[PDB]
From a paper:
The cap open reading frame encodes three viral proteins (VP), VP1, VP2, and VP3, that form the capsid shell. The AAV capsid is comprised of a total of 60 VP monomers. All AAV capsids exhibit T = 1 icosahedral symmetry, but only the shared C-terminal VP3 region has been resolved, while the extended N-termini of VP1 and VP2 are intrinsically disordered. Within VP3, the central core motif is an eight-stranded β-barrel (jellyroll motif) formed by two sets of four antiparallel β-sheets (βBIDG and βCHEF), with an additional βA-strand and one α-helix.
For AAVpo.1 and AAVpo.6 capsid structures were generated from 512,823 and 539,729 particles, resulting in final maps with resolutions of 1.79 and 1.77 Å, respectively. The amino acid sequence could be readily built to the density maps, starting from amino acid 198 for AAVpo.1 and 217 for AAVpo.6 which is comparable to all previous AAV capsid structures. The lower residue number for AAVpo.1 is due to large deletions in the VP1/2 common region. Amongst the AAVs compared, AAV5 and AAVpo.1 share the highest percentage of aligned residues (99%) and lowest overall Cα-RMSD value. Both AAVs share very similar loop conformations in VR-I, -VII, the HI-loop, and VR-IX. AAVpo.1 shows a ~2-fold higher transduction efficiency in Lec-2 cells as compared to Pro-5, indicating a preference for terminal galactose. This behavior is surprising, considering the high sequence identity and structural similarity of AAVpo.1 to AAV5. The sialic acid binding site on the AAV5 capsid has been identified previously and the substitutions of methionine (M) 569 to valine (V) and leucine (L) 587 to threonine (T) on the AAV5 capsid resulted in the loss of sialic acid binding ability. These residues are not conserved in the AAVpo.1 capsid explaining its inability to bind sialic acid compared to AAV5. For the AAVpo.1 capsid, this is not surprising as there is little sequence conservation with the AAV9 residues around the 2-fold region. In contrast, AAVpo.1 is not recognized by mAb1-6 and weakly by mAb2-7.
Numbering used by the authors:
A (entry chain D), B (entry chain H), C (entry chain 2): 198 to 716
The structure:
């Protein structure tokens, strides 16, 4: 932008603007960027870890870092989120603007145990966006490093890396393994006066459904009126078939037009009461898994179409659950966490249309009845998509992801990501940034590449603006709705606020489904 | 319409008009409307009934009643239906017009065991349509109360009620239970001179397929020509692999492009011969079921994609069958019915592409073969939608439903209702009507609402006009087709006609699939 | 309107329409009108009753009845009210439309213990509005007879009567007592085809404040900074004056710009725990009272400016409280009611700016200090309006009144009615209606007025439409707000819904103050 050393290249924008059918969120944060890998690209790999060869991989770490705004709380204050979920039947993203500005590059020198930091006014950072999706898209896998929830917090940009193909579930590559060089893209170079701006339009995507059903999928018939349909009930002692009319309100017997969503049975576990759970279990051997390339992988939180719990029940299908930490956690922690440390979400709103993850799905005939053979049924633990099936996709959370990239295979079905949010063919592109290397003193020629660099890091601001489209509520429900509310019994701190040490406290996961609709 | 006491507000229209690619049906009937619940809204509920807690519910009954034209015989005479199904490959509804007129409100007084009926010229009825689908949509669940099949028959409008959510499969409500007040809508008020008119356009929907396949899905290859493809046949005594060419007409061995529809195995039962059936069976424990919200429900007639019987066979998968009564039945009857009382439909036309409901679906490899281990297979009793699968949706019947509302969840697959007919996102809206309350003598003030009303009922005519689009047959079949025909051996009455007592007799269910097409 | 016998003169309108800054409510109800006093005007009076001569009065009852829509639930469904109070900082009425239509006049004859009811097609009702406020305005005194909360309920119009002046607190009139004849106004006469319409604009009036303060009136100073002001603290042993700086956050000592509202101390009583209350008290002798014309009257709920309770406390100043019945009650009941029968409102939201009704207001110096005389203070139990005082007026409730007429005296202060709502100089005018008398058989002349009339009553519909202006919330609060929500533990019925007998159940009083604002 050529603002120059003494002129700011942008202003602080954090706001929300509510229009009748649209809302515009604006978020600004301060970032800091290390020089990762000391300006080197490094092959990274691993064999089997923790007794699973699904943990083997081959890939690369890069000197670059990237901006990740793919969580709802990056854009939405808690109050704004409340206003959203209490009043609207749905929402979707429409457009995006990003600005990176007020660049400051610092040099670091260490001498005799003391560290000195100074401006380097002539250094650059490099920024580009991968508009054609030519790089592995690591955004939307639920990884850390997003713009923080709380605007004053200063955050470190995560390092860009990726896994390509590995051979036979080992740490070796294959002939098809790809290396991607990020310097092989055009990128803008910014000194301290320069800035970067980017605009993007979302593709057409369905509204997220921010309502809960007020009817049960199998109870849709008028309770006052019989069906004109008849069901087989019994055989008499001579084997003749006997039938009965399907009476009003007998929902066990009514013919059905529509069927519940697909399910994969998932083990149920009791929360807050240990005495009901089986003691000293190691989950991993009995976890739900899918096989790929000769290895077994955990598939949490299972495909869409189930509910992980019943309302006002302490039993959860944990592998069907999005589980968040109430606090930020250090990288690499292996510590065991307990329920009170975590935010365990509930999909219970969808229980009228989604099957319960920890029960059987149903039963079908498994034999051929005859004079000597009584009819029998088998139960089933999984059932995939059926003609005429309906379900609700997983809810989104203030703490949760927004979008995910639909993999490019040429074939898919119902592209809504398991974690929740908007499946996108062309998502917001990766935004990559790195500190340009500055060599240190070099006296003599060599054909060997320079390895010795001045230690530098950079800092600046980033602004993200998203236009959201809203779907208005159009309910005729007479009695009041359930609404998210700030109710606490004798609080010692304000939730969604900094505490006495300045830590931002969040003790609840807030979903979107409060208002109701009939089916 | 302000016609006035002595002027009719509409005329009787029952006709059909056949245009080349369209047909317009017009139906007029006389209705009678009780004052249900004596102008009160009543909470209705139930616990477990007949040993099933799937029969528990919570809901409301309303003073309103509603017009239900959602059966084919409301619009189609038997002869017209014959003309449709013998000559056309498909049809779909396009537009709708409804008129309610010639309102007559009667007051009823009972004194000393004698009942007197008189006109009340100044009373009103109230009518409205739920255009935004803001109320539970109870139409399209197969319940009674439709416009009668036979035009002179006078019918009672059914009472509007609905089930909302209940708690833990009991008779209690939950926090999410909805109460809907129908007086919270604008509605037109009609005295005896007034009328009501409504028009509606159907959304684009696929033609119903009124043909049967003349080829088997697995027999599509030219019987005169070998495939250029080879199959594994055996291993020799040294374990070497052996292969053979797939020969002409060997349809057991041909490679396949396409696969049959999804299936859920359903128990088969013999009709008209009791000796083959298992004696004294109570079906309910061994019925097919699906689990929802912690309860088990019968899912008849199963999802689309199966056939319930084979042509010229007496074995039926009864829970895969639409079963109608030949006669109208009284409300609430628990009597046992026998086969000769009922119309048991057959989907046998689809047997070349739909799998047979009472057999296994197939078999797949269940182990890993090696030097010491012979290959084995398991059979499967259910198989859901596969890539490249094809099937035919259930046929529609003169006696059967027309449309159903697709539930509003944001996610579904192949929205064609299990019962048969057209799945609609925005179906013809509920048309609701009630007798406006007229208080009786009130001498003194009270803040308590008036409970004492003059007993009234109303009667009038309703006309429904539907424009249907037709898909012309374009067959090159040389030999004659199967056609629905009026063939009876020594009849003692005319079918689809009133008998000596005036009862309208219908002894057959008439489907649509007579003409054939190659695949 | 001259619709005629067989033509409806209006339609049913109950709806709400939400525009961005305005909301339009439309309500329609069915009414029934007795012929009160058999078409006679009657002097009514009373002496001392229950030992209080404040109960003496002189006045008149009229044959007329009147429409009273002066309660919020006449216009607002519970869900709509929820939407209002959760999202907006205020509202006020703007315009009004009323229609009376579908008139039906019935004649009643009783013979041998049996009652017969028939239409009288040629009878009239008479309607007029008192546009110039020339009659005693009885609307807005908290009396029964309003349009019901629940739209299907049919209600009886209350009888119009009024009290004029009485002599010396007895049952006699004075020379200044006024008799008002309602037939001395022009009025429209309606047969069964006719209707009546009226439109009205509200005067400019302040928005009701639908928010609660998030700051305490005495805590407004920055807690991080000292005042530059000093306070007298002590005298030393020689009598010299000593002073100290007012330190940061010491809100006991800070100089104040502003002062709390006016108060009248009111006795506090414990709810739900009887053991803390004084036993067997008769309240009336110790009630708060004001004297007028030589008699003593209870002044509940006291003037504005107090709070009746503290948050999460069981102590209430009951005479400072609006107390509603959860149910409709019969006229004239003397039964004792208990807390669980009643809705006891809480003004606790205003506790940061309004003084607590059951404590003392403060203390002031009551003597002159000197060498021999220690300073003393008296406490005070009442304090009226002070310069620089601020307070919040009483909240409004879904169950409560909307407006009140400011008395016409030429002098008043802060005209907001004690009960809550909008003080209006020219409120919506009285709407009066009566059944025109129809004499019975008269054979001979007399100069004495006819006393013998055919017994008649009338019924019809009334529609009321109000345009409301809204004040949008403009909060920067980061953390979530308190919101009214439909939370019930194991409900056996749906609140704000009809129960199994059809009774409309309301177990909560819903105020407007949920959102917060800083001072």
């Amino acid at each position: 932008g050529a603002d120059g050393v003494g002129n700011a290249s942008g202003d602080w924008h954090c706001d929300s603007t509510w229009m009748g059918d649209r809302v515009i969120t604006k978020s600004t944060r301060t970032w800091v960027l290390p020089s990762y890998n000391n300006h080197q690209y490094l092959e990274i790999h691993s064999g089997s870890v923790d007794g699973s060869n699904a943990n083997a991989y081959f890939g690369y770490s890069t000197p670059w870092g990237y901006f990740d705004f793919n969580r709802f709380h990056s854009h939405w204050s808690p109050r704004d989120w409340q206003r959203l979920v209490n009043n609207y039947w749905g929402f979707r993203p429409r457009s995006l603007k990003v600005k990176i500005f007020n660049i400051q590059v610092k040099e670091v020198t260490t001498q005799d145990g003391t560290t000195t930091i100074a401006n380097n006014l002539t250094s650059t950072v490099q920024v580009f966006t991968d508009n054609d999706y030519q790089l592995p898209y690591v955004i939307g896998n639920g990884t850390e490093g997003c713009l923080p929830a709380f605007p004053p917090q200063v955050f470190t940009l995560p390092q860009y890396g990726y896994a390509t193909l590995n051979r036979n579930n080992t740490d070796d590559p294959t002939e098809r393994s790809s290396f991607f060089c990020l310097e092989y893209f055009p990128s803008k170079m910014l000194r301290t006066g320069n800035n970067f701006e980017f605009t993007y339009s979302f593709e057409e995507v369905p509204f997220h459904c921010s309502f809960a059903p007020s009817q049960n999928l199998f109870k849709l018939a008028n309770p006052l009126v019989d069906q004109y349909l008849y069901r087989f009930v019994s055989t008499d002692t001579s084997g003749n078939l006997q039938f009965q009319k399907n009476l009003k309100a007998r929902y066990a017997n009514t013919y059905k037009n529509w069927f519940p969503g697909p399910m994969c049975r998932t083990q149920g576990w009791y929360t807050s009461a240990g005495t009901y759970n089986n003691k000293g279990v190691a989950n991993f051997d009995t976890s739900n898994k899918m096989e790929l390339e000769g290895a077994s992988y955990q598939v949490n939180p299972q495909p869409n179409g189930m509910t992980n719990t019943l309302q006002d029940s302490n039993k959860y299908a944990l592998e069907n659950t999005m589980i968040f930490n109430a606090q930020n956690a250090p990288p690499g922690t292996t510590s065991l966490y307990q329920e009170n440390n975590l935010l365990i979400t509930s999909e219970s709103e969808t229980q009228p249309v989604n099957r319960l993850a920890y029960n059987t799905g149903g039963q079908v005939s498994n034999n051929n009845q005859n004079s000597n053979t009584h009819p029998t049924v088998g139960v089933y633990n999984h059932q995939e998509v059926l003609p005429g099936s309906v379900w609700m996709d997983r809810d989104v959370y203030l703490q949760g992801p927004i979008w995910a990239k639909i993999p490019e295979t040429g074939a898919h079905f119902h592209p809504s990501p398991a974690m929740g949010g908007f499946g996108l063919k062309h998502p917001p592109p990766m935004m990559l940034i790195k500190n340009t290397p500055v060599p240190s003193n070099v006296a003599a020629f060599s054909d060997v590449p320079v390895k010795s660099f001045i230690t530098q890091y950079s800092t600046g601001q980033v602004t993200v603006e998203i236009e959201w489209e809203l779907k208005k509520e159009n309910s005729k429900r007479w009695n009041p709705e359930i609404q998210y509310t700030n109710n606490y019994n004798n609080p010692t701190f304000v939730d969604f606020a900094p505490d006495t040490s300045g830590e931002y406290r969040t003790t609840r996961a807030i979903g979107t489904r409060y208002l109701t609709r009939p089916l």
